């Protein structure tokens, strides 16, 4: 079973600008662990597979969360620390292009379709249950969980938004953008560490340990 009520409850329970962004991301990695523990059946996976899924998905999972948090912000994002990052500030820090991708491909699209927190939570749970993550002890088990999430999400969409038959597909089709943006953010983070001019806290730093890609 994979009830969307549990997924929403998980969202509601966890309810240099680049330095501020790194500080917020490290903070939210702790909260991400507590969120995942609230997603049905995640905690019943083998401990090493829980590690794999979170190491593989953390950047997309965090991006989805702060993007949805920012749907009412104009030309900016709300960090979990209560700070706002304006697109002019991101641009002034040398990360304007990828920041604009988040605003254009994620935040604005979430705003335009009024993606709700149940839908957000379900998309994040799909990202979490990534059966292509390398090293999983039982990929089919993770694929089965992803399939239960999407089945539940579609039923929710069809019941709450029956006038929008394409809505379920529209939600899923933000995931390629999320994957591209997540990959680019990781590239930036490896550069920040290489140059050494940006503090990176311990949990964020641990995500940079091998394995990579």
């Amino acid at each position: 079973d994979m009830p969307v009520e549990r997924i929403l409850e998980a969202e509601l329970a966890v309810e240099d600008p680049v330095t501020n962004i790194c500080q917020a991301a490290d903070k939210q990695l702790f909260t991400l662990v507590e969120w995942a523990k609230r997603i049905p059946h995640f905690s019943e996976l083998p401990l090493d597979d829980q590690v794999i899924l979170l190491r593989a998905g953390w950047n997309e999972l965090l991006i989805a969360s702060f993007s949805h948090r920012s749907i009412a912000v104009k030309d900016g994002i709300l960090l979990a620390t209560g700070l706002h990052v304006h697109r002019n500030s991101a641009h002034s820090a040398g990360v304007g292009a990828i920041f604009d991708r988040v605003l254009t491909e994620l935040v604005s699209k979430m705003r335009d379709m009024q993606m709700d927190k149940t839908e957000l939570g379900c998309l994040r749970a799909i990202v979490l249950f990534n059966p292509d993550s390398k090293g999983l002890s039982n990929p089919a088990e993770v694929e089965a969980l992803r399939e239960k999430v999407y089945a539940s999400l579609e039923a929710y969409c069809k019941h709450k938004y029956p006038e929008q038959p394409g809505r379920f597909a529209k939600l899923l089709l933000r995931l390629p953008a999320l994957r591209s943006i997540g990959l680019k953010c990781l590239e930036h983070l490896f550069f920040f560490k290489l140059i050494g001019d940006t503090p990176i806290d311990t949990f964020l730093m641990e995500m940079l340990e091998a394995p990579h890609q």
Binding site: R55, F203, E206
Partner: peptide, 12 residues
């Protein structure tokens, strides 16, 4: 061996 993540996952 992903020390922080393991510790946070294993606890209650």
């Amino acid at each position: 061996k992903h020390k922080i993540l393991h510790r946070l996952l294993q606890d209650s």
